[PDB]
Amino acid sequence: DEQQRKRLEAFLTQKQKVGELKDDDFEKISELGAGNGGVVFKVSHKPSGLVMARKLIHLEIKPAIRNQIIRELQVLHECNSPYIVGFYGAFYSDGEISICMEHMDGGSLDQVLKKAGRIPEQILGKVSIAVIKGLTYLREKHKIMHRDVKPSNILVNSRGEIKLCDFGVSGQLIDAMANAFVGTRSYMSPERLQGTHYSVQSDIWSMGLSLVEMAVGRYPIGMAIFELLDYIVNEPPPKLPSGVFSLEFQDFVNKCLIKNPAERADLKQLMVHAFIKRSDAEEVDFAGWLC
Amino acid sequence: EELELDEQQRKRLEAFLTQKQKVGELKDDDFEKISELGAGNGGVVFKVSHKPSGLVMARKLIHLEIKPAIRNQIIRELQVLHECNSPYIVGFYGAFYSDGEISICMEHMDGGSLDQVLKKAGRIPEQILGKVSIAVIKGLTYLREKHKIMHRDVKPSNILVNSRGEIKLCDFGVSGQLIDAMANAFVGTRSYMSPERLQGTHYSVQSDIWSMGLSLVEMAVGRYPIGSGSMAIFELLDYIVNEPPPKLPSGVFSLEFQDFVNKCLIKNPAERADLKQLMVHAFIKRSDAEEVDFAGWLCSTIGLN
Amino acid sequence: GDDWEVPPSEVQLLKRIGTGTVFRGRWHGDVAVKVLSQPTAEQAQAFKNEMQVLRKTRHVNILLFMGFMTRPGFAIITQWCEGSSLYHHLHVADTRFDMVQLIDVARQTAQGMDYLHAKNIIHRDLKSNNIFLHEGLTVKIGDFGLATVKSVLWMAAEVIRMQDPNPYSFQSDVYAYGVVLYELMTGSLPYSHIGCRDQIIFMVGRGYLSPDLSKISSNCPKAMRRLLSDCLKFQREERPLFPQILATIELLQRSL
Amino acid sequence: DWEVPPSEVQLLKRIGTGSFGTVFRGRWHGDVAVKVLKVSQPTAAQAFKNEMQVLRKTRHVNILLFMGFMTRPGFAIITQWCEGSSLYHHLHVADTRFDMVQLIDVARQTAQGMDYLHAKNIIHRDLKSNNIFLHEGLTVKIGDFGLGSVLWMAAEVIRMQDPNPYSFQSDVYAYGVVLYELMTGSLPYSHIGCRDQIIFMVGRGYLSPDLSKISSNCPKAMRRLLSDCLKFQREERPLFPQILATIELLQRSL
Ligand SMILES: CNS(=O)(=O)Nc1nccc(Cc2c(C)c3ccc(Oc4ncccc4F)cc3oc2=O)c1F
Ligand SMILES: CNS(=O)(=O)Nc1nccc(Cc2c(C)c3ccc(Oc4ncccc4F)cc3oc2=O)c1F
Ligand SMILES: Nc1ncnc2c1ncn2[C@@H]1O[C@H](COP(=O)(O)OP(=O)(O)NP(=O)(O)O)[C@@H](O)[C@H]1O
Numbered sequence A: 001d002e003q004q005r006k007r008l009e010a011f012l013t014q015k016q017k018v019g020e021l022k023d024d025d026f027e028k029i030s031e032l033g034a035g036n037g038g039v040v041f042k043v044s045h046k047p048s049g050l051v052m053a054r055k056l057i058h059l060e061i062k063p064a065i066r067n068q069i070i071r072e073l074q075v076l077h078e079c080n081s082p083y084i085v086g087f088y089g090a091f092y093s094d095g096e097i098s099i100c101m102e103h104m105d106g107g108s109l110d111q112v113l114k115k116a117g118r119i120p121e122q123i124l125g126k127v128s129i130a131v132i133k134g135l136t137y138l139r140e141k142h143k144i145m146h147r148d149v150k151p152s153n154i155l156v157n158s159r160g161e162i163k164l165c166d167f168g169v170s171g172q173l174i175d176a177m178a179n180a181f182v183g184t185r186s187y188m189s190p191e192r193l194q195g196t197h198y199s200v201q202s203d204i205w206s207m208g209l210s211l212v213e214m215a216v217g218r219y220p221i222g223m224a225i226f227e228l229l230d231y232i233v234n235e236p237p238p239k240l241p242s243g244v245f246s247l248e249f250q251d252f253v254n255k256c257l258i259k260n261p262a263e264r265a266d267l268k269q270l271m272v273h274a275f276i277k278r279s280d281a282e283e284v285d286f287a288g289w290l291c
Numbered sequence B: 001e002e003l004e005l006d007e008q009q010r011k012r013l014e015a016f017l018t019q020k021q022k023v024g025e026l027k028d029d030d031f032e033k034i035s036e037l038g039a040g041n042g043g044v045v046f047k048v049s050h051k052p053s054g055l056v057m058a059r060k061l062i063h064l065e066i067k068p069a070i071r072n073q074i075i076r077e078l079q080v081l082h083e084c085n086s087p088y089i090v091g092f093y094g095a096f097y098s099d100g101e102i103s104i105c106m107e108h109m110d111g112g113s114l115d116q117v118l119k120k121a122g123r124i125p126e127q128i129l130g131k132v133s134i135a136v137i138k139g140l141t142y143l144r145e146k147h148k149i150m151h152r153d154v155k156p157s158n159i160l161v162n163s164r165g166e167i168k169l170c171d172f173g174v175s176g177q178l179i180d181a182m183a184n185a186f187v188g189t190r191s192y193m194s195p196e197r198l199q200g201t202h203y204s205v206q207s208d209i210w211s212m213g214l215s216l217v218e219m220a221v222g223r224y225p226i227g228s229g230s231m232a233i234f235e236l237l238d239y240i241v242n243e244p245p246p247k248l249p250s251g252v253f254s255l256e257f258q259d260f261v262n263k264c265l266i267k268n269p270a271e272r273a274d275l276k277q278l279m280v281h282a283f284i285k286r287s288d289a290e291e292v293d294f295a296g297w298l299c300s301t302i303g304l305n
Numbered sequence C: 001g002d003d004w005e006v007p008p009s010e011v012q013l014l015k016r017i018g019t020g021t022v023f024r025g026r027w028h029g030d031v032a033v034k035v036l037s038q039p040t041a042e043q044a045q046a047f048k049n050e051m052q053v054l055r056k057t058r059h060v061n062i063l064l065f066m067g068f069m070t071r072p073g074f075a076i077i078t079q080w081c082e083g084s085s086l087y088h089h090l091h092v093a094d095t096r097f098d099m100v101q102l103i104d105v106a107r108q109t110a111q112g113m114d115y116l117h118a119k120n121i122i123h124r125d126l127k128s129n130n131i132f133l134h135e136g137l138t139v140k141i142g143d144f145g146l147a148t149v150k151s152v153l154w155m156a157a158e159v160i161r162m163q164d165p166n167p168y169s170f171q172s173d174v175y176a177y178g179v180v181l182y183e184l185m186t187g188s189l190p191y192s193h194i195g196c197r198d199q200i201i202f203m204v205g206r207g208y209l210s211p212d213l214s215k216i217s218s219n220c221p222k223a224m225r226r227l228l229s230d231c232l233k234f235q236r237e238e239r240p241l242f243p244q245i246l247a248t249i250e251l252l253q254r255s256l
Numbered sequence D: 001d002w003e004v005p006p007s008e009v010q011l012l013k014r015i016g017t018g019s020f021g022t023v024f025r026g027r028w029h030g031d032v033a034v035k036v037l038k039v040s041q042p043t044a045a046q047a048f049k050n051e052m053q054v055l056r057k058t059r060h061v062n063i064l065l066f067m068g069f070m071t072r073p074g075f076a077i078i079t080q081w082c083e084g085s086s087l088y089h090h091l092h093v094a095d096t097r098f099d100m101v102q103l104i105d106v107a108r109q110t111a112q113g114m115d116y117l118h119a120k121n122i123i124h125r126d127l128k129s130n131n132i133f134l135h136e137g138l139t140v141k142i143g144d145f146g147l148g149s150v151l152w153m154a155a156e157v158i159r160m161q162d163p164n165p166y167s168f169q170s171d172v173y174a175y176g177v178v179l180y181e182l183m184t185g186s187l188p189y190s191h192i193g194c195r196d197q198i199i200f201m202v203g204r205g206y207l208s209p210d211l212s213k214i215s216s217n218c219p220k221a222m223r224r225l226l227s228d229c230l231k232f233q234r235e236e237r238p239l240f241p242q243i244l245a246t247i248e249l250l251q252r253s254l
């Protein structure tokens, strides 16, 4: 819309004064969080005067494989969308890869969920819309996937923006980050967990599991990680309780957690679902609820 | 005159040389150990059987970490011992190198060394020591006249005896390289070294004469006479150079024997007696005339080892 | 025990090597200083273990523990190894190794692991990154921060499941050694194209995925392929122990 | 604990017999060296276990790796197996070609190991080129410490009169003779055939190594360090913190 068009042009104007990023140009502000393969810090870039989120990923790889990943992410320069986090640059230096992106002062919904206890349904409707629109942008404009939808990768800011991050843009970085330690939680669809055949329908599963988690404030499957993986493959999916949440939102997560990817809803069906069109009509003060 | 052999001596020497011809080349695999005869600062001696000929030999093994050329030169210099044939010198069969050990195969003496006999006898009688003094003087004279070789290591452990009554010398400096290679040694416990050599003079047989006299005193009283009580090698080396020489007690031993060791223990090598004066000394002249059954005393009174 | 503590005044730190954090240092010569500051009640028991495990190791194929520091924080001092890790030689620098060398590195790694197991030590974290080729010749096994006394690419299935009685065992170390064998014989890491991490976890844990032994080099002998596959077996009960691994390697070495 | 059951160890070829015992190449989790001590009947025993507690204090790359001990059937020490030769063998037997940069490196590594031992309150008591192994032809390994040959013995050790004849300084003098071997390529008193003469003179001060054989390529600071280590009075000899620092500062100024 008019506001989103102005913010994107404003971000593109600030992005033009960035250029090349090097290690010596930064000063760390604070540590935002760390995960299975990376740690994120709030940094100040003195050459342009911009605050950014700097993700550091450690990788000992051959020189050719290292050069491939750096330019495999330059596609992010074309991922300009109100539901996708912006991109400044990425560079390697002495075993670690730094990825500079737009700072989100609200953090991830995983951090916001821990403070709120539970995220209200009206807020989750605005969240569901941005995730569907963000995935649709990546599928039609860039013909890739997200591969890693979860509350840890859904970022928010004071201005009320909802954007996504940490999706598969560099394929060998995907294979390189497979050499990682045993994770702590699972958000993969059972067919993704099982074997090779999969599609973008698993992203819908991962946000469906994310919606249920943020709605009740509890990881809904349930243990060591393998037992969780076996539960996703075997047992039926979780669902929200009956009395609390609306049947529209109940029917939304059930069609998003249907185990078969062919019976599960597509991004075209969820766009015109009863729960999505209802919350888009709702006027919710998302910026105020976050701040 | 005194390098001459009697009929029994000349028969035994030709008998040894006859046994020696049937030996030939020596190899490690031809030997089997019978018993260990003893060990020293750097060497160990075994009683061994040479299978091809059936001869019993004494096999001294000396461990040396030296260049292969020095090893070959030591073996090459020990071939002189083939020419050291004397009734007062231990026989020699051959020398070879194997497993880092230079092996010296020599005549076996079933009576052992006088250092072993002294421990059994407590004290060696003067009449026996007279025949010992004769064999050392004649043995040194043979080395100096026939080969111009000095002994450099006269002491009771290197005076060997056998059941036939023979008294022979062993472990003398025939190989100058073996002398140098065995200088890198470990500290000893005793010394029969002359004070002039402990200080730095060029080597002379007068040093061996001192070592003989010091040995005679030890075997006569049954105690190492240099030092006090115990002492370490350096303190003993101090006595030899500074303190006056030792002497036999006056009461029991004859004045001839007392004067014989004193002329051997004069600390100045120029005034010390040489091998010609001691040969015509009263103790030696008296002892050579005495009829002493040494083979009987060794076999019957002491035993064999 | 305390005789291995080193005062910080005696130790000098030089160049930072990487990330705890490792420094090249000086304490009676070149050393490595791993700075693991006020310890939590459990990490003290943890540092009490890596140090206690290291204090029980006296073997040429185990990284030489030299001492520890308690100030400003806990730190471990070891020998300084010259060269690179086996991971660096195989997956970074593309080092030209003969087949006799690869078998020798496999033999030395089994030599160190056999020593650890004889001391009832389960390394629990054997990987190519923790194997150092000192002077390009001698294997040095390190990183005992997870070792105990009695990534997923080197993890056995029973450890990835965490359900079976005593998941970590000698056999779980053997599987990790088997993946190291896969690196030596294939020159690459296992599952080098499957992008989904949890897939690897669930598939390997269930048995639906295993290292692809078709990438084994042509010059790898048949006895080395069987030893490789025997160390990678799904059921830990059938994987051989390091005494048998050593006898197998010493057998194939004896005749080229 | 570091005691090893004798059933776990297989003895192979005998390597040689030293002053302390006989060394065999053995097998115990790889190649090992097993020194079987002299006597078999164990008198007293605790001294052996006390000596083993000294070897247990050493964890240094320039110190021979102690691996374990055996109390049955006799007393035995298990160490790492050094592939290669001793420094004595390299210098006086094989005549190996070393540059001065390598000789000072061996001298530095030997000082590095001795500095560690003395920092651990360990007097070697028997340092010599025979007990220095060039492992892999690269790394110095010092062995047979805290458990000799006259050529490395100080005068106060020869006399055995002064209080505490064995000290750090007696180890320094032994290190000085090793320096003499490295700088001259030969043993001290190369042509003095009488063992007893070599002993009596050195103990009194009348004899000392011949610094005229020191190669011209030897730096002047090394010759001074060598002569300081060979000083007759033990009180005037430098300790290994100074010896090591002197070499390490000299090397930086090549
Ligand atoms: C459990 N999921 S999985 O098993 O499917 N594996 C994987 N999933 C998903 C992705 C990857 C790898 C990857 C990652 C992690 C990545 C992270 C950041 C990035 O920058 C920005 N991104 C978006 C907005 C702004 C940015 F600055 C690019 C990235 O590009 C990547 O490709 C995986 F390995
Ligand atoms: C304390 N005095 S000292 O310091 O001068 N050292 C030395 N003294 C004297 C000599 C030497 C070297 C030496 C040795 C030791 C030696 C040993 C046995 C040998 O076999 C036979 N021997 C005699 C008869 C028959 C043999 F088969 C020949 C030997 O030939 C040798 O040359 C010394 F090192
Ligand atoms: N040919 C031999 N026949 C019999 N016993 C011998 C013979 N040679 C040596 N022995 C014995 O072996 C023992 C040890 O010999 P050895 O190694 O020479 O000791 P050592 O004479 O005291 N030291 P050294 O100075 O080299 O002569 C001697 O004490 C003798 O009893």
Ligand SMILES: Nc1ncnc2c1ncn2[C@@H]1O[C@H](COP(=O)(O)OP(=O)(O)NP(=O)(O)O)[C@@H](O)[C@H]1O
Residues within 6 Å of the ligand: D015, D016, D017, D018, D019, D020, D021, D022, D023, D033, D035, D064, D079, D080, D081, D082, D083, D086, D126, D130, D131, D143, D144, D148
């Ligand atoms: N760790 C070892 N690895 C290989 N060879 C060894 C080792 N320790 C000793 N040796 C060898 O074993 C033999 C005997 O050694 P040893 O018993 O120490 O006598 P030594 O070193 O010559 N004199 P000493 O050390 O005073 O007893 C020599 O050939 C040494 O090189």
Ligand SMILES: [Mg+2]
Residues within 6 Å of the ligand: B040, B157, B158, B170, B171
């Ligand atoms: Mg002798």
Ligand SMILES: [Mg+2]
Residues within 6 Å of the ligand: D018, D130, D131, D143, D144
């Ligand atoms: Mg030794």
